[PDB]
């Protein structure tokens, strides 16, 4: 009875395959073509207890933008498919994740209405090879296809890797809460 | 043994009857004479899983103030009665409720000491016919008779209906948490 | 064959029926339960040459918010359905509409990615009975279900009725341009 | 049949004759007694494809003000006459005209309601013998008798001749668009 | 007969071949040695309906500057050759292109007088491997050999890839408009 | 020999009938569909000694804007008709009207050139049901069809009803002066 969503989409720019189990055990199998994004998608599994499979190739010789965007769009669609009729779930999720000096709060509602409120202050332009502009775009695209209300608020942080990873930990744990069943419903 | 509180009070200005079940299933029956307040009281039921019955008539030809106040006072008293000795409950409740661009956090303690910390920025004076000054007065009056410590904090929001509705969603879910029993 | 999109949705709050003909002749048939919004929807027909049929009733005894939102959502869905595969259309639309002292520019792309950039300065809270906060929410909701990129920018204006009506005229003409066929392709 | 408007008016100060063909081929025939204004009126023909005939003499021994004003008034009246019932025309016109470093946007509506929004920053007081205060007065007077809604906005420019000429190019192209027939209606 | 311009130039730094068809069907054939610039040149084809063939190699072991510059110079020369006597063309082009949150307006005139007005605010120094200083230099060099008046103005935008891509979409559509024939003349 | 002007105009939005006697005795018969506007039009009669008849119905279910505008336009046309050749009249009018704490000066010229200079500071958005944005629009529209130069300047005032009523008293008395005959002419 596990809630599994899957999305495959091939364009001239990217080839994306995503599978997510909302009732998973934290199995991570992420090969997006973007190593830092893979590290962040691993946090979805380890902290959200989702099973997350992502396989993507794309025009990373231009930059990571199209791959990042199309992976995020596909995850949002897979999430929407896995949620089904959304009956009985908590629907709302909240979590404040510290990572050393970083502290990020995520508040979300599986509402069917896309909205991103985004207030991160990432002080460097690259983490490894990853363009830090792509963090906002990842969550914006995921919101757009999942129909999620998502608020990301940075309360502390100076290390870009810490800020982004804390965001994914908080998102993962908030999304876990929202997708879990409300025992009184 | 569901925890049910009830308050009826008739004054020269208003006639108010309130019944709340802390262990409800979200049954909403709200007819306060103020349609937007009814919509907000419905959030108490649907998001707090309270059973909420409010029936009020009043001098709404003056304005909604006396009705709004007397309904809020009665709800706080009904909540206090329903809580009884408060043994074994979580007592504290916390929730951040987004509603599109709005985000409101509610933190409360069923402490017996009334206090309202209120920091909403509602940018318009009317939602429908509802005077938005009445939002603060609703929570102040409810706090005063329930003896609740209540903190309402707006983190984002531009639409007045969204801000107020997010506040009631967060309040409902925080109050649900506070009234539920601590398993340990 | 004319491109027609139609959507009916009944909720506990609203009862909404929408039909739009992208290849219309300007037939205006708008009865949303919100008279000023009807006047604005008429601009879609008169200036966009769309055939626009909207019939809605709702919980306007609370306020106009739910009706306004559900009408906007339904129009966006009807627009999306009417566009079909979007093959051969201009896709982009641009128009600056004056209305006396008001001047509003609209730029849009039928992109499949929802985004609203909104920069109006409406100086009063009510036009008739219409809550002027509902203008932004109308376009946000329409954007969300149509998948449109939409930018609304006020360059001039002091009368709220003029500002909002100029916005709908500019939107109507930009959308007409975007939905029309590109004769070269 | 071409839409032609013609107006002659003789006062104690000026003697003005104007004929404009909205469906012209760009015939420029401008002898206002103000050489720089003639150069600007030529842009109406060359860029708007109007046929523009202006012949004026006046009390230019005082200054160019009365001639400038009476020419502008007459052009607006001729334009109004030529438009007739305005059935089937685009009615709105928009154009951004660059001239080297200058860039001026014109937005107009053949509305029947006079309004001038004017935001040029002309940095010198004379172009040749032409008093640059007369630019605003020209468009104000033309607006007043034509019943036009007209917005002129400078986005760039440092040379007064360039700024004014770009304004007339943009006006010419916007007016051409507004007076042309809408092929769909 | 299609208007085709072609230019080959070999220097000690670069080897550049360009062919452009002003009356094309959107054939994109761009291999400049700079992958992000290739992606931008593709917009010329996809949104301008030009046929754009660019093949360049160069001293990219130093940086992309010489290749970027020499490609831009060659495109401007090819455009100039293809335009011929410019008889009968619209000559002016205008377009506002959104790309999600980005919005860029381009206004241009095929005037024979080079000028670049450039007002982009690109917030990162690299898109992929592409140095974002090269955007201004690309358009400056293209302007210089084509003899174009070109104004680029950013109205919105936070993602560098979006801002630059919106600029090339707007440029492509403005240039398409300017090079197309004026049906009335 | 009384100077009487009359205007009837029926549109899809409004049905307006106006009759004004410049040589009246202050007979007021105003039913515009806007009660506060009726009160203001009564001031024209009582303070200007005009006979003022206005009968209007319109789409006041939207708001009062279209009715307000069309009544003002019709009054301006009726005024222009009543003035005839304007021979022998004072032409200029000036009056400062106090109303308790409010003080408003009106200066006008029956010039044939429309202009409104408007400097009121009305501190509330509604007087009764009347939208105070409509005051400026009333005088602007009246100016546009009458061809009047009109300057309205607030020197004092805090009560919106007082400010607007003082404006109409001052306008009425200034217009009375301007329409009266100059005994030396
Ligand atoms: Cl606003
Ligand atoms: Cl100036
Ligand atoms: Cl920059
Ligand atoms: Mn993108
Ligand atoms: Mn790490
Ligand atoms: Mn009170
Ligand atoms: Mn609601
Ligand atoms: Mn809403
Ligand atoms: Mn209107
Ligand atoms: Mn003058
Ligand atoms: Mn010149
Ligand atoms: Mn260089
Ligand atoms: Mn791209
Ligand atoms: Mn108006
Ligand atoms: Mn009074
Ligand atoms: Na943000
Ligand atoms: Na209607
Ligand atoms: Na000449
Ligand atoms: Na390529
Ligand atoms: Na003013």
Numbering used by the authors:
A (entry chain B), C (entry chain A), D (entry chain A), E (entry chain A), F (entry chain B): 77 to 261
B (entry chain E): 77 to 260
Text taken from the publication that reported this structure:
The crystal structure at 1.55 Å was obtained in space group R3 and comprises eight chains in the asymmetric unit (ASU). The crystal structures cover the MtHISN5 sequence starting from Gly77 or Ala78 through Arg260/261 (chain and structure-dependent). The crystal structure at 1.55 Å resolution contains imidazole (IMD), sodium ion, chloride ion, formate (FMT), 1,2-ethanediol (EDO), glycerol (GOL), and tris(hydroxymethyl) aminomethane (TRS). The crystal structures were obtained in the presence of formate (FMT) between Mn1 and Mn2, which completes their coordination spheres. FMTs primary location was in the active sites, between Mn1 and Mn2. However, it was very interesting to find that IMD (IMD1) bound not between the Mn2+ ions in the active site, but instead was positioned approximately 3.8 Å from the C atom of FMT. In MtHISN5, IMD1 forms hydrogen bonds with FMT and water. The fact that we see FMT between Mn2+ and imidazole positioned differently suggests that the bi-Mn2+ cluster has a high affinity for carboxylate, in addition to the imidazole of IGP or IAP. We postulate that the carboxylate and imidazole binding sites can be used as pharmacophores for the design of selective inhibitors of plant HISN5. Consistently, we identified TRS (121 Da) and CIT (192 Da) in the 3- and 4-fold tunnels, respectively.
Plant HISN5 catalyzes the sixth step of the HBP, in which imidazole-glycerol phosphate (IGP) is dehydrated to form imidazole-acetol phosphate (IAP). The MtHISN5 subunit contains a four α-helix bundle sandwiched between two β-sheets whose four strands are almost perpendicular to each other. In solution, MtHISN5 forms a homo 24-mer with octahedral (432) symmetry of approx. 110 Å diameter and a total mass of 540 kDa. The dimensions of the MtHISN5 oligomer did not change significantly after the binding of IG2, indicating a lack of major conformational rearrangements. The active site of MtHISN5 (see below) contains two Mn2+ cations (Mn1 and Mn2) bound by residues belonging to different subunits.
